[PDB]
Every structure is written in structure tokens, then in C-alpha cells.
Design a protein around this ligand. Structure first.
Ligand SMILES: Nc1ncnc2c1ncn2[C@@H]1O[C@H](COP(=O)(O)OP(=O)(O)O)[C@@H](O)[C@H]1O
Ligand SMILES: Nc1ncnc2c1ncn2[C@@H]1O[C@H](COP(=O)(O)OP(=O)(O)O)[C@@H](O)[C@H]1O
Ligand SMILES: [Mg+2]
Ligand SMILES: [Mg+2]
Length: 514
């Protein structure tokens, strides 16, 4: 019911509504995958002409303008279609935007530097490492930084960023958010992202897109950024009168050592890793965070006996472990069902707590006939997370499980990790680059500091407060608690609370409504 903006094919996905871009404003778009976020951006960018639900018909620009006349969006579209707007679009699929890239990072950026901001962006996005590398040879994260950089250098009216936090480490995400905020004043900016802290930093306004993945999406009205993210956490949109999730994502709610490790040293070629002694309690979640190339995965690999430490040990030396590696690939002949059944009797019995909380809530129950090699990154991720979690263990290690996940699935996963760990009185280490995930479920954290590729030093497990304080300080940002949802809120650099908390040394504030 309502007015269809676009439909790709008969009986296919349909989109209802569009957000209006606003000048001198950063507009966030948020929702689970498969609901039309990328479609919305491509419409806004002028790459797709809305067909108003008829994929047979070739709608012209004139027709689109007649259909919008009187409405909020008309004027944007008039300017778009009358070629009065220069549009920059940092596309979602960065790996596809790679095979048309000739030359080094420096020379690509030098070619397109229209705003004389090359050197500025180099600094802001910390690109000196990438500087004389071939665009062709770049990893996910280097490509993402190169395209975001390239977008910042362009002189344009509208800048569109589809998921710029993908492949970025915790530090890079924050730098990218600072860079966009700083360099794109007095422009139309639209951003889609699944990292809530990135969105919170970047956005003035927020639209939620909700619906059923691959069936339909509807765009909410514009909310003030803070409110929009809060309604998303509550899972309720007041204006639309819409329960978009049956439960809420709540922050800040309310003995024996199961394992202990000495100082751990590991040298790999050039890179030296040092990890401080520590211990973990039964039921406890230790988040691990730090930039990439710093030894987090090496540390994971030491804990699972894949790599031997050069000095130091973990007691007890042999325990039942369950491991979700960072690098995920289809390595199995059989179905999702066969793979899950192999892992646990629980995982697929409609009878257990697991099936409904994890399996079903991950929507893995819909992929049972699929064989593992058919699955997308997102689906393999959930499959490996679910399998890992279904196994009865003393120790769980999950490496970057939020990669490939949308904004909903990461919190469903987060919740599950907590549930399994506490249920089974186990230790869980989770490495992740989404800071809200840590805030949401980590009981203590380990911070990795140093120089990517050369040296990493990791602290013992400390309180979120103790670790975040030191981590945020280096990163030069301050966090407070939102009054309504208790979610972390990042003070925009320069802001009222930002310089005061900075003087106090209170970078990670546990105070409500700061
Ligand atoms: N060219 C297309 N033809 C048919 N279906 C498409 C096409 N492009 C996207 N879709 C579908 O529309 C839905 C919404 O996709 P998209 O806008 O990319 O979602 P999101 O960005 O929110 O993940 C998904 O079903 C997607 O596969
Ligand atoms: N087997 C290895 N041999 C030599 N160097 C390695 C090996 N495995 C990882 N490295 C290097 O060690 C550093 C630490 O990597 P890793 O533990 O993968 O970091 P993170 O998970 O923090 O990104 C990286 O620079 C990586 O290239
Ligand atoms: Mg998309
Ligand atoms: Mg890693």
C-alpha cells in the first residue's frame, strides 16, 4: 500500500519513498540489507531513473519531474536532471571499482585533485603507507580509503557514500568520519553505513529504511540524527507508527578465573608482538580492539594453538575451544544443514534455545538446502558464527565477526555471543572494529597499540572505561552516554562537550546526558 518509487522487475523488490537531500547537511541512511539503501542512493545520484513500479516502461526525466511536482524532492530532482548538480558517488562495491584503476595511489589522487586538498587527505586518512602502491594490488581497506580519498578531492555539489566503513579498521573508520565531516561543509552529503558510531559522528539527519529484505523497503521521514539512531535501537518509528524489530537494542543494563596467560611474545618476520599477562573469568567477554596489522589475529591464533608463542603460555594448556577465523572461505562440500548438524544437535532442533535465538535469528534456517559454496560473504559469516557458537566449549574466539554483516545482524550476533558465553560459563574473545559492539557486550577489553606491520603491544584485560579512555585519547575523540538509550555518543570535534571532557581527561564518559 502506498506509492511505489521503483521496482526492478514484476514480483521483485519494490521501494516506497525517497529521502530528500539537504544542502550543507549530512544525511544518514540506515537499515538492514536488501531493503533499497543502495537503490535510493543510485536514484539520488541519477544512475537509476525511478520507474514508479513499472519496470516495462521507460520513464523519462520529464515524467519523473511531473510526478514529483509540488513535493519536497522535486527541486533536487529538477537540479539533478537539468545537470546543475555535480555528483560524487563512492560506490558500495569497492572491489568492483578497482579493475578500472590505473597507476599508483599518489598519481590517481594527483590527477583528480580539483580542490587542492591532496596533502590534507593524505594526513587525515593516514595514507603515507599506500602512497606509492599500485591501485590494482590494493586490499579491501586500501581501496576503500583510496575511493573515499578520491571522493573528497573532487569538486562537486553532492557527495554520496555507500558503506564507507566496510574493510576499515576501528581507527580508520573514525578518521574517515572526521575527514568527511571536516572537508564537506556546505555540500549535500548522503551516507549509508552500518557502524552506528560512524553514523553518529557524521550525520545531522537520519532516515531509517525498513521492510523485508529483497521484498520491499520504505524510507521513514527525516529524524534528527540522535533521535533517528535511538528509534532504530528501540526498534520503533513513532511517525510511521512502525514496529521494525520485535526487541530493543539496549545499552548499559545490569566469579572464578577460567584461564590465565603470562606475557606472550611472538616474532613474525619484521613484526614483533607483545601481549601483557592477563586472565579471564567464567562467562566473561573480552573484546579486542586496535588498528589492522597490529597482531590481534596472531594473538587469536596463539590462543587456538594454530601458532606457537615464542615466549609465554596459557593455562590450562589444552581446553575445548571453538574458533571463528577472520578469513572466511567456503571449505565444505555439503549443505548449510549438514554443516550445522556436524557442529551441534542443538543448532537445528526447533526444541532448543539456540535455534530460535541464533540459528533462526540469523535467518540460517532459510538456507539449509544451500550448499556452503553457494553462500555470499554475509551468509558464510553467519554460518561460521552460528556453527562456532553452537559448539560446546571452554573458549570461544571470534575474529571480526561483524564483517559482511548489516546493522541488524551484528547486534543479533552480539547478543548471541553474550548468551552462549554466560550460559556455558565460558571465555570468549571477540576481535571487532565496531566500537558499539564492544560497548554493547564486552565485559573487559584488550587494546592493541603500535605500528601496523612493525610492532604491536597489547594491554592486559581492563575495564571498558579504562581501555576506551586511553584508546579514544590517541584518537582525539570523546564519548558520552545518550540520555534515552545509554548508547555511546561521540562529541563532534570542536563541540561544547568535546573540549571540556578533553581537559578532564574524561574521554570515555560514563555520565548520562553530557
Ligand atoms: N538490477 C537489479 N535487478 C533486480 N533486482 C535488484 C537489482 N538491483 C538490486 N536488486 C534487489 O533489490 C533489493 C534491494 O537492494 P539494494 O538497494 O542493493 O539493498 P541494500 O543496499 O539496502 O542492501 C535486493 O533484492 C537487491 O537484490
Ligand atoms: N605467518 C606470518 N608470517 C609473517 N608475518 C605475518 C604472518 N602472519 C601475519 N603476519 C604479519 O604480522 C602482522 C600482524 O598481523 P595480524 O596478527 O594479521 O594483525 P591484525 O589481526 O591485527 O590485522 C601483520 O603485519 C601481518 O602481515
Ligand atoms: Mg547496499
Ligand atoms: Mg586480523
Amino acid at each position: 500500500e502506498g506509492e511505489v518509487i521503483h521496482r526492478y522487475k514484476v514480483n521483485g523488490f519494490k521501494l516506497f519513498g525517497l529521502p530528500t537531500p539537504k544542502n550543507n547537511t549530512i544525511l544518514g541512511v540506515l537499515g538492514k540489507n536488501g531493503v533499497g539503501k543502495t537503490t535510493v542512493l543510485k536514484i539520488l545520484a541519477g544512475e537509476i531513473i525511478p520507474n514508479f513500479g513499472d519496470p516495462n516502461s521507460k520513464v523519462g526525466k520529464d515524467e519523473v519531474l511531473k510526478r514529483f511536482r509540488g513535493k519536497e524532492i522535486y527541486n533536487y530532482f529538477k537540479e539533478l536532471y537539468s545537470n546543475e548538480l555535480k555528483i560524487v558517488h563512492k560506490i558500495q562495491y569497492v572491489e568492483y571499482a578497482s579493475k578500472f584503476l590505473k597507476g599508483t595511489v599518489n598519481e590517481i589522487l594527483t590527477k583528480i585533485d580539483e580542490r587542492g586538498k591532496k596533502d590534507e587527505v593524505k594526513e587525515l586518512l593516514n595514507m603515507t603507507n599506500l602512497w606509492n602502491k599500485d591501485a590494482n594490488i590494493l586490499s579491501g581497506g586500501g581501496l576503500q580509503r583510496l575511493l573515499v580519498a578520491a571522493s573528497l578531492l573532487r569538486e562537486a555539489d553532492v557527495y554520496i557514500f555507500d558503506q564507507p566503513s566496510s574493510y576499515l579498521d576501528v581507527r580508520e573508520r573514525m578518521n574517515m568520519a572526521k575527514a568527511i565531516r571536516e572537508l564537506l561543509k556546505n555540500k549535500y552529503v548522503i551516507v549509508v553505513d552500518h557502524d552506528l558510531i560512524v553514523l553518529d559522528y557524521l550525520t545531522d539527519l537520519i532516515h531509517i529504511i525498513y521492510g523485508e529484505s529483497s521484498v520491499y523497503g520504505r524510507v521513514s521521514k527525516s529524524y534528527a540524527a540522535r533521535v533517528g539512531i535511538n528509534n532504530f535501537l528501540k526498534g520503533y518509528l513513532p511517525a510511521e507508527n512502525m514496529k521494525i524489530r520485535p526487541d530493543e537494542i539496549k545499552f548499559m543494563l545490569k566469579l572464578k578465573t577460567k584461564m590465565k596467560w603470562t606475557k606472550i611474545i611472538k616474532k613474525l618476520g619484521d613484526f614483533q608482538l607483545v601481549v601483557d599477562n592477563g586472565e579471564a573469568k567464567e562467562g566473561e567477554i573480552i573484546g579486542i580492539l586496535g588498528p589492522n596489522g597490529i597482531g590481534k589475529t596472531t594473538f587469536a591464533r596463539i590462543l587456538v594453538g594454530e601458532i606457537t608463542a615464542d615466549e609465554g603460555s596459557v593455562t590450562p594448556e589444552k581446553q575445548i575451544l571453538s574458533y571463528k577465523p577472520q578469513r572466511i572461505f567456503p571449505n565444505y562440500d555439503g549443505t548449510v544443514q549438514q554443516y550445522l548438524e556436524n557442529a551441534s544437535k542443538d543448532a537445528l532442533s526447533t526444541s532448543s534455545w539456540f535455534f530460535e535465538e541464533v540459528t533462526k535469528r540469523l535467518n540460517l534456517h532459510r538456507l539449509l538446502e544451500s550448499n556452503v559454496n553457494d553462500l555470499s560473504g554475509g551468509e558464510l559469516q553467519k554460518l561460521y558464527i552460528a556453527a562456532t557458537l553452537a559448539k560446546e566449549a571452554d573458549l570461544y574466539v571470534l575474529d571480526q565477526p561483524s564483517s559482511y554483516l548489516d546493522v541488524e545482524e551484528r547486534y543479533i550476533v552480539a547478543k548471541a555471543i553474550k548468551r552462549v558465553t554466560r550460559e556455558r560459563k565460558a571465555v570468549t574473545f571477540i576481535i571487532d572494529h565496531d566500537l558499539s559492539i564492544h560497548d554493547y557486550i564486552a565485559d573487559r577489553i584488550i587494546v592493541f597499540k603500535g605500528e601496523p606491520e612493525k610492532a604491536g603491544l597489547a594491554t592486559s584485560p581492563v575495564t571498558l572505561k579504562t581501555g576506551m579512555n586511553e584508546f579514544l585519547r590517541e584518537l582525539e575523540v570523546t564519548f558520552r552516554r545518550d540520555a534515552e538509550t545509554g548508547r555511546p555518543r561521540v562529541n563532534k570535534i570542536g563541540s561544547y562537550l568535546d573540549r571540556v571532557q578533553k581537559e578532564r581527561g574524561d574521554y570515555y564518559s560514563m555520565v548520562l546526558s553530557t
